[PDB]
């Protein structure tokens, strides 16, 4: 995922890791850290999430007593500014042939947080689904990429992700596979992706809409991940979207709608490809692009 963020957004502020490189850790002194604290820890870029057990007037009285007047005005009126980061479709392939399992991710730029189509790109991503080798569903699993993978023993795990940032996202699939079936997993992943993108059915999208509704309420069950949703939704969406409005956004999504906005965000696009392990039986990038766009449609 760090290699994919390095090769997907090269030359931008999204290329770097959250941890930072080892040549940049060793020169971090105290005054650079307090410059970072004085710049990026400002008060209206900060939310105070509580979840259950609290009272909001008690929390606002305690925030008046304690978390009031943090910092509002900048030093030399030097505001930080978000930039639209360039997505560059690229390929990085760290070849370690003595390493046992190849982790390969393929991702296309998705619309991000503030664009309203994260629900329909997530319902396509949840039709595609996920598999790990400890899942006891077997051949009879509903996602056909996982069914094909356990039918002909392709990979150990695959996980389809919609990681979003402000106007820029990575949506794709990362698979832990063996050294002998990366070509099979790449071909069947692009075949399942654009079988979804050409021939989406009502049964498939109601399966995905049901699994998204269950996945969102199972994510927002617990107090700590619902505070994660409150903080992430207040920083990104502006307001916090309630789940009744999430249900109203889910129930408008049909297979025709999924087909065209999949044609917006999937079809003939150059993806970013990362790989750590024995990446010899990964196809080259022109074979990835020829395996994207379909010979029939």
């Amino acid at each position: 995922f760090d290699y994919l963020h390095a090769t997907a957004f090269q030359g931008t502020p999204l290329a770097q890791a959250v941890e930072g490189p080892s040549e940049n850790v060793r020169r971090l002194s105290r005054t650079d850290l307090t410059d970072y604290l004085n710049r990026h820890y400002k008060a209206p870029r900060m939310v105070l999430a509580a979840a259950g057990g609290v009272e909001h007037q008690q929390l606002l009285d305690l925030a008046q007593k304690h978390l009031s007047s943090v910092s509002r005005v900048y030093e030399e009126d030097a505001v930080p500014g978000l930039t639209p980061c360039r997505f560059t479709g690229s390929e990085i392939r760290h070849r370690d042939d003595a390493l046992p399992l190849a982790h390969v991710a393929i991702a296309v730029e998705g619309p991000g947080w503030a664009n309203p189509d994260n629900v329909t790109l997530q319902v396509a991503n949840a039709i595609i689904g996920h598999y790990d080798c400890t899942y006891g569903g077997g051949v009879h699993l509903s996602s056909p990429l996982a069914s094909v993978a356990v039918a002909n023993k392709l990979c150990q795990s695959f996980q389809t992700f919609n990681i979003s940032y402000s106007d820029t996202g990575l949506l794709g699939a990362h698979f832990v596979c063996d050294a002998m079936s990366i070509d099979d997993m790449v071909f069947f992943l692009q075949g399942q992706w654009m079988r979804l993108c050409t021939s989406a059915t009502e049964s498939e999208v109601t399966r995905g809409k049901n699994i998204l509704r269950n996945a969102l309420v199972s994510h927002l069950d617990g107090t700590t991940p619902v505070c994660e949703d409150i903080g992430r939704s207040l920083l990104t969406y502006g307001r916090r979207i309630p789940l009744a409005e999430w249900e109203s956004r889910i129930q408008e999504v049909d297979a025709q709608m999924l087909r065209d906005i999949c044609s917006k965000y999937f079809y003939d696009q150059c993806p970013a490809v990362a790989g750590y392990g024995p990446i010899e039986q990964l196809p080259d990038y022109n074979r990835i692009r020829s395996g994207m766009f379909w010979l029939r449609f």
């Binding site: 410059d35 030399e76 505001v79 930080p80």
Partner: protein, 125 residues
């Protein structure tokens, strides 16, 4: 939006680099104001000195005149791109206008010696 151009540049108020600035960029602007203040105070002291009777010897204008006049051949390095583009720009239109002048004059000399071109009232040639 308004697309930039090399001849119609982006203004600094519409520039995206004016809106996402850093304290090192602000320190650079403070140091630019400091060096403009030092040069303006030196120029204004030499302006309002009444002991001065001559002009203002401008060192950057002397530097620009020296760089445009007598620095170009000491700072020549012969590169193949400069050699090919200078050879084209110093030789090419001479062969081109040679072909134009020789074609037009071969046409005129051929038509005069064959009699097709007539100088009807052409006294002062």
């Amino acid at each position: 939006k308004y697309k930039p151009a090399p001849l119609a540049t982006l203004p600094s108020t519409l520039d995206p680099a004016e809106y996402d600035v850093s304290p090192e960029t602000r320190r650079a602007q403070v140091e630019r104001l400091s060096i403009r203040a030092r040069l303006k105070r030196e120029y204004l002291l030499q302006y309002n000195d009444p002991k001065r009777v001559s002009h203002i010897e401008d060192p950057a204008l002397i530097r620009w005149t020296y760089a445009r006049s007598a620095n170009i051949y000491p700072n020549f390095r012969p590169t193949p791109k400069n050699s090919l583009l200078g050879a084209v720009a110093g030789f090419g239109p001479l062969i081109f206008w040679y072909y134009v002048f020789k074609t037009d004059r071969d046409r005129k000399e051929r038509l005069i010696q064959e009699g097709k071109l007539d100088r009807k009232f052409n006294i002062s040639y």
